Structures are given as C-alpha cells and as structure tokens.
C-alpha cells in the first residue's frame, strides 16, 4: 500500500525538489542504510518528515562540520569497533543557486545551468556520498557551517558524535546545510517510521509558498 506526500521544502535536494509528489511504500522490518524514509516527527508526531536513514541501531555516527563528512562505525552499543566504508566524490558545482530574501527570513532555490551565473545568490556545491554499498547526492553551502552549540548532544557523548540506541535511527537531509534533522533533534524511534519513499508520482515547478509555473514530467518515475 502506497501513500502520497507533497514535498514543500528543499531539505532533500537534489534528490527531491520542492513541488515533487512522492509515493511512499508503507513498511515487519526495516530501513536499510541510505533509505529515504517518511516518519512521524518525534517531538510533534502530528507532523510527517522525510529524511535519509544514515545511522541504524548500534552505529557510532560522527559528523565533521568543516569537511561536512560522516564517519560511521556499526555494531557499537559501546562505544565498538567497526568502520563502514564511507567515501565522497570530489566537490563539484550543483545545478542549484540559493538566494535569500526577506519579508515572507527565507531562501529560494533556482536551477541554473552550470555555464551560467545567477546575479544574486550562492551556487551550492555537490558531492556523492557512499555509505557502505549505497550512493546518493548531497548539496553543501560553502559559507555555511553547523553551529555545534545548537546540536542535539546525546548524554555522555562528545558533541557531533552519537551512538544510535537500539530500535532507533539517525536521519539526515541531503541538502545538508539546509536541513533540520537528527543533528538538531535526536533519534527516530522505529514505531515512528511510516515507510520508504520509492517514486515520484508527479512534479510541479514551484517555490516554497507559491504556485507553480508548470511541471516536470521528466521527474515522474523511480527516485535516484
């Protein structure tokens, strides 16, 4: 059984874009590392969130705010001792420029040919991130850095390091400097998982909080 959801934000760019309408395959068992997962937001389960399951139960996960890379050690209730091969391709320009605005503290995303410049805005960087045996793209913002003082600090771990409790997950957005995720709010209980996002049903050209120009039928199909 499939459940459709609309994508209002850029947190999962470039993989999912604002105005995408996705289909979720409801989960039993269990997300694989790197799965795109819809889940009930722990602190407000009236809200559905969509993120990538980067950390599974037992993983020691560490995030470097400067290089903006993950380190993952599985089977590590304490505290372990076994590295997942996590590798990154070289940074390259992405298809998007992010431009900030006022009246509505906000930002807009614009797909800009890589041979072009947008007058106002900052071009996001792109890399591929491989977590063991699965690979996806991530966008970073060169002038942005995570303020570790705002991080969720797990009891008894140092900052920017987490050990995923049994029965729980660590979620991260692909638009890494524009995603409020487990780094800020902690783990996602297994019960809170709705399902895996497997396809784009429909897509509309749109910005956050407005209507759409037109469509993106090229996007209908599996999620890559």
């Amino acid at each position: 059984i499939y459940e459709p959801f609309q994508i209002p934000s850029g947190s999962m760019m470039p993989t999912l874009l604002i105005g995408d309408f996705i289909l979720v395959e409801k989960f039993t068992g269990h997300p694989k590392r790197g799965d795109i997962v819809v889940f009930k937001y722990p602190e407000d389960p009236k809200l559905d969130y969509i993120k990538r399951a980067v950390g599974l139960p037992g993983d020691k996960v560490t995030y470097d705010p400067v290089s903006k890379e993950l380190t993952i050690q599985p089977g590590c209730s304490s505290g372990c001792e076994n590295a997942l091969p996590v590798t990154y391709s070289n940074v390259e320009p992405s298809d998007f420029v992010q431009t900030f605005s006022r009246r509505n503290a906000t930002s807009g995303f614009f797909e800009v040919p890589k041979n072009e410049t947008k007058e106002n805005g900052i071009r996001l960087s792109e890399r591929k991130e491989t977590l063991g045996d699965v690979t996806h793209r991530i966008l970073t913002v060169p002038i942005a850095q995570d303020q570790v003082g705002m991080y969720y600090q797990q009891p008894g771990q140092q900052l920017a390091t987490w050990i995923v409790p049994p029965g729980q997950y660590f979620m991260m957005g692909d638009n890494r400097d524009n995603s409020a995720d487990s780094r800020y709010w902690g783990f996602v209980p297994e019960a809170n998982l709705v399902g895996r996002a497997t396809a784009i049903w429909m897509s509309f050209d749109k910005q956050e909080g407005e209507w759409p120009t037109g469509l993106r039928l090229s996007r209908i199909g599996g999620i890559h």
Binding site: E3, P4, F5, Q6, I7, P8, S9, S11, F21, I22, V38, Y41, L47, D48, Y49, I50
Partner: peptide
C-alpha cells in the same frame, strides 16, 4: 493522503 512531509 496528500499531506506534506518536511
């Protein structure tokens, strides 16, 4: 369905 996912 047809709700948002943040």
């Amino acid at each position: 369905x047809x709700g948002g996912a943040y």
